[PDB]
Amino acid sequence: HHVVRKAVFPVAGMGTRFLPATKAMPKEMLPVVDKPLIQYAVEEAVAAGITDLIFVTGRNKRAIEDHFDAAPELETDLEAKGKHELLALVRDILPAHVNCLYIRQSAPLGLGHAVLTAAPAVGNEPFAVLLADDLIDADTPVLKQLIDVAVARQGSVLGVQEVPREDTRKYGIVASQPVDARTERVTHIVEKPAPEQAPTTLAVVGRYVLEAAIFDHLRATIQLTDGIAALLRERDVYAHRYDGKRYDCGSKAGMFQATVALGRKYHGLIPE
Amino acid sequence: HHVVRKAVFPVAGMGTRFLPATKAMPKEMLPVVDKPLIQYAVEEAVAAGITDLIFVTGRNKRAIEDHFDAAPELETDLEAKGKHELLALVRDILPAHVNCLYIRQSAPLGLGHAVLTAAPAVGNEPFAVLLADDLIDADTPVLKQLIDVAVARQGSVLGVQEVPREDTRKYGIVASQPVDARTERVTHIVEKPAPEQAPTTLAVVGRYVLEAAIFDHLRATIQLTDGIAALLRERDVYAHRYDGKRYDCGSKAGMFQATVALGRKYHGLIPE
Ligand SMILES: O=c1ccn([C@@H]2O[C@H](COP(=O)(O)OP(=O)(O)OP(=O)(O)O)[C@@H](O)[C@H]2O)c(=O)[nH]1
Ligand SMILES: O=c1ccn([C@@H]2O[C@H](COP(=O)(O)OP(=O)(O)OP(=O)(O)O)[C@@H](O)[C@H]2O)c(=O)[nH]1
Ligand SMILES: [Mg+2]
Ligand SMILES: [Mg+2]
Ligand SMILES: [Mg+2]
Ligand SMILES: [Mg+2]
Numbered sequence: 001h002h003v004v005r006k007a008v009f010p011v012a013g014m015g016t017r018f019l020p021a022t023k024a025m026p027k028e029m030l031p032v033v034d035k036p037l038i039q040y041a042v043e044e045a046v047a048a049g050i051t052d053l054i055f056v057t058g059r060n061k062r063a064i065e066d067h068f069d070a071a072p073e074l075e076t077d078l079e080a081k082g083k084h085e086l087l088a089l090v091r092d093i094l095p096a097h098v099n100c101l102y103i104r105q106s107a108p109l110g111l112g113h114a115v116l117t118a119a120p121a122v123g124n125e126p127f128a129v130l131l132a133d134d135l136i137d138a139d140t141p142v143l144k145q146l147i148d149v150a151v152a153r154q155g156s157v158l159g160v161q162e163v164p165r166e167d168t169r170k171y172g173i174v175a176s177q178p179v180d181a182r183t184e185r186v187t188h189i190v191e192k193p194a195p196e197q198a199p200t201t202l203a204v205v206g207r208y209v210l211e212a213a214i215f216d217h218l219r220a221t222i223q224l225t226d227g228i229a230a231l232l233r234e235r236d237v238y239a240h241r242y243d244g245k246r247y248d249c250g251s252k253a254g255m256f257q258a259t260v261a262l263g264r265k266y267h268g269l270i271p272e
Numbered sequence: 273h274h275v276v277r278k279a280v281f282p283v284a285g286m287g288t289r290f291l292p293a294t295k296a297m298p299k300e301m302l303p304v305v306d307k308p309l310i311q312y313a314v315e316e317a318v319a320a321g322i323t324d325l326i327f328v329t330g331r332n333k334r335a336i337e338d339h340f341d342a343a344p345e346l347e348t349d350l351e352a353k354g355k356h357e358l359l360a361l362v363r364d365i366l367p368a369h370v371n372c373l374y375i376r377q378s379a380p381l382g383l384g385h386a387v388l389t390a391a392p393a394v395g396n397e398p399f400a401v402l403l404a405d406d407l408i409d410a411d412t413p414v415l416k417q418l419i420d421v422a423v424a425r426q427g428s429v430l431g432v433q434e435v436p437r438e439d440t441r442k443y444g445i446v447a448s449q450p451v452d453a454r455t456e457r458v459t460h461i462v463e464k465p466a467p468e469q470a471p472t473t474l475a476v477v478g479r480y481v482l483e484a485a486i487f488d489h490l491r492a493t494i495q496l497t498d499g500i501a502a503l504l505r506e507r508d509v510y511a512h513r514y515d516g517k518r519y520d521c522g523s524k525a526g527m528f529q530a531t532v533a534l535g536r537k538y539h540g541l542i543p544e
Contacts, residue, residue, distance in 0.1 A: 021303035024338035066296035
């Protein structure tokens with residue numbers, strides 16, 4: 001009985017691909033229009049049934065915690081001016097059945113180290129990992145799509161998307177074999193292959209459902225990719241081509257396209 | 273001998289027109305592409321000859337201070353990975369002839385109270401005021417244009433822009449008389465007039481050069497507009513229609529247009 005109720009948000013990194021905006025502000029707090037990247041990722045997890053949110057964070061990232069906590073002085077200001085609609089955007093941003101906890105990563109030693117850092121809070125359960133700089137706009141939350149596959153197949157699941165072959169140098173690419181239309185069994189993961197040498201055009205994105213067996217593989221490993229490759233030998237790992245549109249907001253170019261696209265879709269904002 | 277060397281940046285406000293992005297992050301830190309609003313405003317002041325930067329700030333706004341201070345852990349990370357170009361975006365963001373100081377505003381009691389809060393650091397000098405949510409893209413820094421007028425005429429100067437008459441309800445509008453092509457003498461300021469009743473279509477923007485005489489008028493006043501109206505009786509106040517394009521980034525709509533426009537101009541980013 002596979003139950004995924006915990007989601008890990010690695011948010012301890014330095015955000016260097018987005019300077020100077022991120023000199024003194026977490027990349028995860030940068031807004032797509034009027035909402036931080038981390039809020040979209042959290043809402044997706046909650047919408048997929050996650051109840052326990054685990055942030056692996058750092059000294060200079062208090063804004064992330066403060067964003068999901070009460071802000072009493074602001075809530076007092078809004079009540080005082082009678083702006084009760086705004087009060088609802090701020091108060092109880094998370095529903096009452098969800099809880100958050102935070103863990104300091106010693107140093108920014110990698111995504112793999114960040115995942116390993118969450119092990120005491122996760123225990124032996126399977127768990128989700130979401131990278132907030134991958135903003136996904138989907139009719140059905142992408143993490144829900146991935147969890148459903150992981151439960152049905154009793155294995156780990158990597159969210160993948162089709163990319164142009166000429167761009168494979170930018171991603172981790174799975175070598176995999178189809179099992180059904182959207183789901184493939186992973187046999188290898190290759191970091192940043194040449195286009196002509198890429199085994200598939202399926203790039204790993206920042207959405208994972210992982211069995212707790214991953215933790216031991218990361219202690220011998222610092223790269224989550226290498227941990228996953230080790231796991232492949234013991235346990236089943238699948239890739240799932242999810243339905244949705246990803247924007248890579250780790251850099252200004254994808255952030256900009258997300259701003260334009262969700263600007264139009266959700267806000268009625270159109271380039272003048 | 274009129275010398276404007278000090279600029280005041282009111283940055284203590286709650287940013288409520290941009291929630292939830294600003295729940296736990298200052299509005300002034302929100303980026304236009306890859307740079308915070310406050311950095312554009314500061315760069316404009318420095319480019320106009322300002323040497324003394326005065327921030328009127330609040331408890332939850334440490335990111336602003338941290339942005340203009342050294343970030344040693346980040347500078348160590350960038351040197352360690354040999355990324356010396358990025359090191360230049362972060363280290364000495366301000367030239368060596370400029371200095372910053374910070375003053376806590378007791379509570380967010382208004383722009384007029386914020387200006388008055390800076391009085392001990394300003395002394396009897398004329399001084400600039402810039403509101404970072406007014407992002408101005410100009411060939412010649414707008415504050416320089418305003419200072420030049422203030423020195424030449426030995427009076428205070430309000431930056432104004434022509435707005436559509438149907439939008440006058442959104443702004444403070446000067447009643448004024450032309451003295452030369454871009455410069456007018458102010459006789460009244462009317463807050464948010466009906467279009468058919470607006471005295472002109474010249475709206476005050478977030479750029480001021482003010483004589484120290486303003487401070488006494490704000491102690492009897494909490495609205496900078498009312499302080500300026502009092503000053504008009506004693507001293508000369510001019511409005512200057514500056515050359516430049518303003519974006520009102522206090523809200524998502526103008527921020528979005530700034531993102532599109534400066535995205536294209538400075539970053540090569542074009543809506544897909
Ligand atoms: O040591 C680390 C490294 C990375 N991460 C987290 O892994 C995710 C994916 O890592 P990214 O490479 O997308 O983000 P980054 O902040 O490390 O970016 P750069 O400086 O390299 O430009 C991000 O959400 C990051 O916060 C950690 O939590 N800890
Ligand atoms: O008490 C105050 C009020 C305003 N200000 C500063 O005055 C400038 C113009 O004030 P704005 O109205 O543009 O900003 P705000 O943050 O007050 O916004 P809302 O909550 O009303 O949406 C902003 O730069 C603000 O920081 C202060 O410094 N202190
Ligand atoms: Mg990284
Ligand atoms: Mg990334
Ligand atoms: Mg205000
Ligand atoms: Mg404003």
